[PDB]
């Protein structure tokens, strides 16, 4: 799958979880690969699930099930909680600010329509749910990495900090190697 | 426009470009600044066209004013114009019968108050204590200028117990050239400075002040616009307030004044 | 935006107006049509202004084409211009050191594909099977006309295994006068007809058509190149509410290409112009 850019949104999530922390370009490129690789597993699983519906539809519940199949343990439970809340806020400014999210609902909606192999509609709530799940994982990976980088008395998240963040988390480590 | 180059959507593609290709992109950046400079000249020419078309728009606006003020009566052609579009012969005839003529009613009451408050952006700036004041508005006009570059909006008020001014003026001075410090961001004319007008409030009627004497939310704070930096404590938020005040001016000038009766009826939503 | 009927926001206020005030509102309705008629003349003059400015833009657009095709090399003035703005410290210098020159790489590969696909609206019409075709685009140009009124967008393609055409043309014929069917709704030039261009596909390459099966029929398949088979207006028709929104979508995409992407192509190439959803 072609690697889309989320850098600007990854940077906005970062300035929330660590307002004083920067992120190098190379660290930013690993984060983007992480988001892209997770998203493509979500899309592939949602396509397979959509075939078990009448008109092959991908809604917020086809993404929720895919998240439960891809994210292990607490990561799933926390991401499902953040995904439901985002869908509930969106259905109740821009589409993403409507869902309380920094990640791009509009772009991810397009990414879902083009990447998924199902024949039916891709609902907007599936875009909202997907963005909230990618944002949550991003915010979790950034919180751990920014924590690591201040342990080293440096103000920038580098590939070393990301790698320490993920290998210091059983769920995240499993998620990455499975992906 | 993304001001942090590392956040550019295709940064990684750019970064991987061989040096000689990068240098071609640099040439395109340079050509793009020249292109924006010519777009700048286009906007100046559009501005001159708006000035030239004022004589034609003014006649239809002057006639609207006379109708609203009750200074002239509708013609037979004007009366045959449906008050609302998309109405059956039934509905229109029934609409006209719903209320008999009232010779005490002169002109069109609350015309500009209703038109302004039907616009979602301007409605949010009209407080309840502004309503009886805006009811004395007899006309809202706008005119543009070449040197200094910008436009004005004039609010014409009939004699009223709130203030003595007959006309309240709002003036916007605009910049039409790209910022030399950042040419690639130019997306058209930008507000340099907004100048309001001193309101001669009668005793006890200043709805812009309240005793907590502190500033109070009021439409008429439109006439005490926020200062630009040369006349200024917070800068990044004073400039946001200047943009909001400019956007409200544009809505009145570009949208409400040319189509006021469509906001009066509520046909523009 | 412009509503026709009893659905007007202030209908109940209108209904209660005494008849003589209603007749005053009718006069303003008549005057408003005169105002819109003058706006029409204004838009015609702006159209001629855009035509006049084609010659002014032409130099920068031609030089961009020459640079992208590899037909001219950057000057020192061009080389000293930063490839990206807003980079701290050594970042610009390190950016220039990140990948050494490659004399085999001529011009700027995939310039117009990258620019088109980074604009969110046009991105939604570019499918994955369109990408390798748009890689052969060498230039995208636009020209406006007074008689008949409208504009065209032309896509120039190098020799490619997908189709034989060297130029794919999309033409929009516009109406500048207020609509006789609804005078008060006029909000500027409106599309009367969109005319596409016949693509001479090589065997097996037509990604815009697909067959579905007792009977087998050819149906439309999602593809950017459906831009060149636009939907018909009512004058040439034989769903009306859904064909006409599709025409508005096609016109809006044409407007984005002509008004935004073509004049600022390199900013979409870099991705310095971003849209917050």
Automatic annotation (TrEMBL), chain B:
<keyword id="KW-0539">Nucleus</keyword>
<dbReference type="GO" id="GO:0000724">
    <property type="term" value="P:double-strand break repair via homologous recombination"/>
</dbReference>
<dbReference type="GO" id="GO:0005634">
    <property type="term" value="C:nucleus"/>
</dbReference>
<dbReference type="GO" id="GO:0006334">
    <property type="term" value="P:nucleosome assembly"/>
</dbReference>
<dbReference type="InterPro" id="IPR002164">
    <property type="entry name" value="NAP_family"/>
</dbReference>
<dbReference type="Pfam" id="PF00956">
    <property type="entry name" value="NAP"/>
</dbReference>
<dbReference type="GO" id="GO:0003682">
    <property type="term" value="F:chromatin binding"/>
</dbReference>
<feature type="binding site">
    <location>
        <position position="50"/>
    </location>
    <ligand>
        <name>Zn(2+)</name>
    </ligand>
</feature>
<comment type="similarity">
    <text>Belongs to the nucleosome assembly protein (NAP) family.</text>
</comment>
<dbReference type="GO" id="GO:0061629">
    <property type="term" value="F:RNA polymerase II-specific DNA-binding transcription factor binding"/>
</dbReference>
<keyword id="KW-0479">Metal-binding</keyword>
<dbReference type="InterPro" id="IPR037231">
    <property type="entry name" value="NAP-like_sf"/>
</dbReference>
<dbReference type="GO" id="GO:0005737">
    <property type="term" value="C:cytoplasm"/>
</dbReference>
<feature type="binding site">
    <location>
        <position position="47"/>
    </location>
    <ligand>
        <name>Zn(2+)</name>
    </ligand>
</feature>
<dbReference type="GO" id="GO:0000785">
    <property type="term" value="C:chromatin"/>
</dbReference>
<keyword id="KW-0963">Cytoplasm</keyword>
<keyword id="KW-0862">Zinc</keyword>
<dbReference type="GO" id="GO:0015485">
    <property type="term" value="F:cholesterol binding"/>
</dbReference>
<dbReference type="GO" id="GO:0046872">
    <property type="term" value="F:metal ion binding"/>
</dbReference>
<dbReference type="GO" id="GO:0042393">
    <property type="term" value="F:histone binding"/>
</dbReference>
<protein>
    <submittedName>
        <fullName>Nucleosome assembly protein 1-like 1</fullName>
    </submittedName>
</protein>
């Amino acid at each position: 799958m072609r690697k889309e850019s989320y850098s600007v949104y990854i940077y906005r999530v970062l300035k929330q979880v660590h307002p004083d922390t920067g992120v190098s370009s190379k660290a930013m490129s690993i984060m983007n690969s992480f988001v892209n690789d997770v998203f493509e597993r979500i899309a592939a699983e949602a396509s397979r699930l959509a075939h078990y519906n009448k008109r092959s539809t991908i809604s917020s519940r086809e993404i929720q099930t895919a998240v439960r199949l891809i994210l292990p343990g607490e990561l799933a439970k926390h991401a499902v909680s953040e995904g439901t809340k985002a869908v509930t806020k969106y259905t109740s400014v821009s589409r993403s600010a409507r869902a309380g999210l920094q990640f791009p609902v509009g772009r991810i909606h397009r990414f879902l329509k083009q990447r998924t192999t199902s024949s039916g509609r891709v609902g907007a709530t599936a875009a909202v749910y997907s963005a909230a799940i990618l944002e949550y994982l991003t915010a979790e990976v950034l919180e751990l990495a920014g924590n690591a980088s201040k342990d080293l008395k440096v103000k920038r998240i580098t590939p070393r900090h990301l790698h320490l963040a993920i290998r210091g988390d059983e769920e995240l480590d499993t998620l990455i190697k499975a992906t | 426009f993304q001001h942090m180059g590392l956040l550019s959507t295709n940064f990684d593609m750019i970064q991987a470009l061989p040096l000689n290709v990068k240098q071609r992109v640099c040439a395109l950046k340079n050509l793009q600044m020249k292109t924006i400079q010519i777009e700048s000249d286009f906007y100046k020419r559009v501005h001159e066209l708006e000035i030239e078309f004022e004589g034609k728009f003014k006649s239809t606006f002057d006639q609207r004013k006379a109708i609203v003020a009750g200074e002239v009566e509708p013609t037979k052609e004007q009366i045959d114009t449906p008050i609302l579009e998309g109405l059956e012969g039934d509905q229109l005839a029934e609409l006209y019968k719903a209320a008999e003529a009232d010779p005490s009613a002169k002109g069109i009451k609350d015309f500009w108050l209703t038109a302004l408050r039907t616009h979602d952006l301007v409605a949010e700036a009209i407080e309840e204590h502004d309503v009886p004041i805006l009811s004395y508005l007899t006309d809202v006009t706008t005119a543009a200028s070449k040197d200094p570059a910008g436009f004005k909006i004039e609010f014409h008020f009939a004699t009223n117990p709130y203030f003595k001014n007959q006309v309240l003026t709002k003036t916007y001075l605009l910049g039409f050239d790209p910022d030399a410090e950042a040419p690639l961001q130019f997306d058209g004319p930008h507000v340099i400075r907004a100048v309001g007008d001193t309101i001669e409030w009668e005793d006890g009627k200043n709805v812009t002040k309240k005793a907590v004497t502190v500033k109070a939310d009021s439409f008429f704070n439109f006439f005490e616009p926020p200062k630009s930096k040369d006349e200024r404590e917070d800068d990044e938020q004073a400039e946001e307030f200047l943009e909001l005040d400019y956007e409200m001016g544009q809505a009145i000038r570009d949208t409400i004044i040319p189509r006021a009766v469509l906001f009066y009826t509520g046909e523009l939503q």
